[PDB]
Amino acid sequence: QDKILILDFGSQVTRLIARRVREAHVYCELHSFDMPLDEIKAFNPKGIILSGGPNSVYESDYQADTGIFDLGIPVLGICYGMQFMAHHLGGEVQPGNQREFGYAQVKTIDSGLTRGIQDDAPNTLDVWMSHGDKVSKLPDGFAVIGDTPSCPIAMMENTEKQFYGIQFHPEVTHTKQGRALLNRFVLDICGAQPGWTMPNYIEEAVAKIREQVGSDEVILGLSGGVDSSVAAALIHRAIGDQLTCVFVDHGLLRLNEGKMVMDMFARNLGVKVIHVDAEGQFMAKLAGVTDPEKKRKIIGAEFIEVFDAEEKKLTNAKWLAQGTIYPDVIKLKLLEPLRDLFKDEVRELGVALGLPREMVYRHPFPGPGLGVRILGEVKKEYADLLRQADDIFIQELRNTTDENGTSWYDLTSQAFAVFLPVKSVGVGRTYDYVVALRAVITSDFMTAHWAELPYSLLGRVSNRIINEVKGINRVVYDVSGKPPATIEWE
Amino acid sequence: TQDKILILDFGSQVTRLIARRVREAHVYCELHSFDMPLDEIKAFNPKGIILSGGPNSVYESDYQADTGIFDLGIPVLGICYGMQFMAHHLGGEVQPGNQREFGYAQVKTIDSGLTRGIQDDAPNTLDVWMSHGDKVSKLPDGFAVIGDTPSCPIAMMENTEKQFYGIQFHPEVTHTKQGRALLNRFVLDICGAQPGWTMPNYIEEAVAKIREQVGSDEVILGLSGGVDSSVAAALIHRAIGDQLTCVFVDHGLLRLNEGKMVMDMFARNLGVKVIHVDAEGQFMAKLAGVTDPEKKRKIIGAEFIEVFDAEEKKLTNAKWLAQGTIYPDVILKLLEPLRDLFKDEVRELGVALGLPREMVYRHPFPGPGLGVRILGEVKKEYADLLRQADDIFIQELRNTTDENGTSWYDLTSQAFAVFLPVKSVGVDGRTYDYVVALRAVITSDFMTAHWAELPYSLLGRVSNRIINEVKGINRVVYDVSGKPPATIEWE
């Protein structure tokens, strides 16, 4: 594999650089700016990207080894990375407020990085611009390739060395052409082969697991979440009957979730799956508990208890497999085959392995499950009502499409129903509980706006829940964004 | 005085819509049952008569108007059953069908006094809400077919000599696109009724009738804050001045500043004598620990009657209890000067009298007030939160307009916030506060209501403002339940 090295100078969006590079189907790794030169050479990158950061290159210990400029490979500096590049290659940096950002229009001239990349007019880019420290004097052998009125050296290039610096963040989508610029650097300037695909990954990952495990037996907890499911499919493909999975239904899962897990793993693949039905045990622990924080502690601790007792019975096991993914890393031995992947790659890998898309491309589901979607006291009675209401909502999201043919399920990051233990009047007079519909679209920055679901979709979901679910006669839609609200109600 | 239209009611569920259409053409009209005696019909002296539809069948029903109406020399329009009734008694014939069947149909017409110049997408074509029940199978004497469909050969008929008209569809429902044009054509052109029924034209007559009714007697009137009792107060004050005393009871379950706005418009601007009772604490004490919504309504209604009655007894030199009774309700002596008006006419009368438009063009407000908008136990703590959130919602509805410049306040029939006694988590730090529901509906002509398709940006701005500005609320939801299957109020 051709690989890109990303050096982290502390910016809050540095991971997005890695996501963009992976989205171009090129392998890459995120390392701190002070990675020793020996490890960099051993990594043998096809190119290096220097991220932004909150510090100032003239007064900071945030200095990478300047030997990176002698490796003979292209280097791209972003904001602080550009300032670092300028500070150490004979240029000058003028101080500003490194916390300030905003929109700007950059004009470019023709270069390897800029040719054929444009927004509404040739050689014009609308960017998410850093208004802080800026390059005030070109380093040696460099040219200006992009400028704005307030930032005369907004983009610079050393053609001989293929060094590039930009004063804006191409990894945030607010820079419309940022992806195109990063692709141009990685695919064309560095010449990195876009071979990092999940079908290409399976055989290498399967071989690494076999070398690691041999004939040993492996246990893996199946939460119902995607990561552990994909870990299961991958490890089973590697070692077959050496894997045992444990699935715990704590009674707080969506409708039919236990059946769907058992069908895709035990029935379809022949994976050995220990199925624990713990609904009654969890409901007993939640009885009379209204505090949401206590509810979260109880459910999490009880789940560990049920899983730990199943682990003890699998006495000839030597590995605990886990669905640890790359954002997590940025007596039983740990087996974590997804450590090098982001969530989107994990999803593609699950489909590649043959898992049903319905189980692999689903909205994330909280650990405490419906426990934080039933306000106040959790009871089987309420969980059963909620599963029906939730399922109707999701059915309609899956079957209603926008103008491009994309379903509203796929357009939203998270969608679910919430059970409110208050009663409303309805029509013969009725007096039943209230359901809230929640649907959000999350950004890259831990915020989320509520989805502008079509009115007819909301109306149809409302009609169906009220008529089809005995016990619910009122439906509301959450119109609180994050911030100031949270996505979950508890 | 007024040219008048008489509407005889044969039992159709939409007969009132005929009266609204006629009033909306600025012609006075009254609704009476089909069996109104002939001498009262003559004494009413109508310029024309409309016979409504109905569910019964003219050959097997006692739903028979006095057939002497066809000898009065005034135009008559029969709608569905009214048309069949017309055909049955003037030498035609009715063929039995299912009077419960209705649906869309395209009526083709020929030129007549009723049909000339009225069309939808092609000349001499009407898209109508058709009765598929009993229908005219043989023309009555001197009548001609002026409208037909493939399945209803006699869909419209005219007797030109007598100015009798019969139609097999309902022009009073908006589903008949030209139904209003047809009704106006009959009322304004064929009957020649003068469109003089305006609220400025009504004031002087209404003032004189009140003065003739009351003389120098004293009158008491309950001010709820609603438009009906307010307009009655303004009108009666216009007639008898210091002879009127108003009683305003604040039970602590009103909207923000409601008592101040009522006192300001009446006691300060007009000089009306107003007895102001601040009964907030007393109502809250009686509602403590009460969660059953039916008991809450019972407590609030009975307690209000007691506070008002004690004030009435103290006004010992009073002879009239005035009420804001309006015409839909009608279809110490009682003084009811608004008995002949629909709500929209009452609103125009309120403006005509000089009341501020904001107090007259207001969404209706329930008797039990916020008591049915605070789910479960009602407390001042919750009412104070709700009044704040409700006011923010209303500010945004008033200040945001559609493509024609109409406010979303004016576009909705009813809009309010509802306080939910459940807590949600929020965000820096972690908050845990109550939930508010926004409710907004648009009512139809048929006692149904759909929830308002408020712009997403408006819901978003209201959500943000309530959560940020109202200490105690950290979550806002929008009610997306229509009627049916839900009710407008939550309790």
Curated annotation (Swiss-Prot), chain A:
PROSITE patterns: GATASE_TYPE_1, GMPS_ATP_PPASE
Positions of the catalytic residues: C79 (nucleophile), H169, E171
One GO molecular-function entry: ATP binding
Domain of life: Bacteria
Annotated residues for binding of ATP: S223, G224, G225, V226, D227, S228, S229
Keyword Nucleotide-binding: yes
Enzyme Commission number: 6.3.5.2
Key words, A-Z: ATP-binding, Glutamine amidotransferase, GMP biosynthesis, Ligase, Nucleotide-binding, Purine biosynthesis
Enzyme class, UniProt record, top EC level: ligase
Domain GMPS ATP-PPase span(s) in chain numbering: 196-362
UniProt pathway: Purine metabolism; GMP biosynthesis; GMP from XMP (L-Gln route): step 1/1
Assembly information from the UniProt record: Homodimer.
Family matches, as PANTHER family: GMP SYNTHASE [GLUTAMINE-HYDROLYZING], GMP SYNTHASE-RELATED
Its biological purpose: Catalyzes the synthesis of GMP from XMP.
Name of the protein: GMP synthase [glutamine-hydrolyzing]
Organism this protein belongs to: Neisseria gonorrhoeae (strain NCCP11945)
Gene field: guaA
